């Protein structure tokens with residue numbers, strides 16, 4: 001087990017940007033798929049490789065997944081309020097490209113709403129949650145080594161690295177810093193302990 | 207009056223109605239956004255301008271924020287404890303409209319539960335608190351001059367002007383009257399001392 005090359009999908013998002021920065025600082029050779037390159041910061045840590053394209057475009061995903069050791073998925077659809085399939089269709093393209101290229105490890109973020117009663121989901125988040133569920137099923141039925149990361153509210157607190165991780169359930173805390181969440185996405189690259197499990201990271205930021 | 211034209215969101219609510227009355231008495235030129243089925247009472251004080259629409263429509267929020275000096279946010283769900291995103295989505299529309307119209311000052315009410323240990327928030331209030339948390343992050347990340355008003359129980363005791371304002375922590379009493387809360391929302395328009403802080407107003411009525 002030695003992951004050196006990773007693809008990150010969703011690297012321009014709030015969690016993606018800090019996951020990308022941390023990965024670069026730790027020494028990973030990171031490839032990102034971005035739809036427009038000007039949103040990547042021009043100062044600080046930069047990825048080794050940039051593919052310009054869409055997770056909905058199978059060829060763009062293929063170019064991104066080729067030659068990787070593992071994939072991190074931090075896709076989201078920003079403000080869709082009504083039925084949407086971007087994340088699950090992108091997950092299908094990711095799965096197909098990982099198969100074609102022999103990449104066997106994927107760490108993907110959905111939501112802790114998948115661990116709660118469906119009546120906890122606010123009405124205007126039901127569509128996105130539904131597609132998270134579709135994307136989770138896609139990844140679980142793929143047969144790939146899949147770590148399901150299902151975070152509660154994503155905050156802006158500083159990196160601590162001291163969060164809780166609860167397997168196949170929700171945990172006591174109900175927030176995770178975007179920085180701590182990115183930290184855990186990368187921690188999942190260094191072990192098979194979470195493979196096949198759903199994970200809930202959460203921490204105290206008093 | 208350096209701040210003269212204000213938008214109030216939630217003016218028909220418990221705290222809104224007395225905030226509106228006090229603003230009009232103090233000489234503010236008040237614009238309100240009201241939902242079509244829920245106008246202001248016929249006998250009560252009259253705002254200068256009424257927009258009929260929904261905080262969930264960007265166009266209605268834009269009409270309400272255009273030309274203002276400052277915004278007060280007293281949105282809420284009345285007695286309804288169901289999951290919701292009306293406050294966080296409304297705040298996103300308010301931020302965008304403020305940025306487009308050159309309005310910097312936003313005084314917005316969430317709840318003192320944002321200062322609690324999360325494991326201690328009553329489960330019955332967790333869904334509403336989750337949207338207050340989402341709303342607070344939207345406003346904190348906006349870069350606007352944002353006063354985060356985080357009250358404890360809102361009661362029916364009198365207007366006093368004599369309440370305690372505790373910065374960035376819980377205060378010494380567990381109640382604030384709706385009239386004192388509205389008085390404090392208006393006070394925040396006339397100083398910069400609470401910008402970028404959380405504020406907990408509270409009082410002992412005797």
Ligand SMILES: NC(=O)c1ccc[n+]([C@@H]2O[C@H](COP(=O)([O-])OP(=O)(O)OC[C@H]3O[C@@H](n4cnc5c(N)ncnc54)[C@H](OP(=O)(O)O)[C@@H]3O)[C@@H](O)[C@H]2O)c1
Pocket residue numbers: 009010011012013014015016033034035036039053054055056074075076077078086109110111112128151152153154155
């Ligand atoms: N906000 C929360 O508290 C919370 C809580 C639990 C779970 N989640 C979920 O966790 C995940 C990460 O969320 P986040 O807030 O960090 O994400 P985010 O800031 O909304 O960014 C989403 C990422 O996905 C990219 N993206 C969207 N559509 C794409 C497409 N067709 N092709 C390629 N890339 C695309 C976006 O690229 P662009 O920059 O090009 O748009 C961006 O990089 C999301 O699925 C979210 O729903 C969020």
Ligand SMILES: NC(=O)c1ccc[n+]([C@@H]2O[C@H](COP(=O)([O-])OP(=O)(O)OC[C@H]3O[C@@H](n4cnc5c(N)ncnc54)[C@H](OP(=O)(O)O)[C@@H]3O)[C@@H](O)[C@H]2O)c1
Pocket residue numbers: 215216217218219220221222239240241244259260261262280281282283284285292293315316317318334357358359360361
């Ligand atoms: N002890 C407490 O009650 C307590 C304690 C701490 C914090 N809080 C929080 O304090 C805040 C203010 O509470 P409150 O009791 O004064 O408020 P409220 O009586 O619940 O009034 C809510 C206001 O928001 C309006 N509103 C709701 N949805 C809207 C929409 N889609 N578009 C436009 N306007 C909308 C309502 O309009 P309609 O007239 O059309 O309904 C009403 O004017 C709330 O966020 C509450 O959660 C309450």
Ligand SMILES: O=C(O)c1ccc(-n2nc(-c3ccccc3O)nc2-c2ccccc2O)cc1
Pocket residue numbers: 317318319331334357358359376379380
């Ligand atoms: O920091 C403190 O002391 C403190 C913090 C929060 C409260 N809130 N806010 C609420 C509340 C009610 C309706 C909508 C949103 C809300 O947030 N309900 C309570 C409440 C909590 C415990 C017992 C009685 C209550 O009325 C009171 C005090």
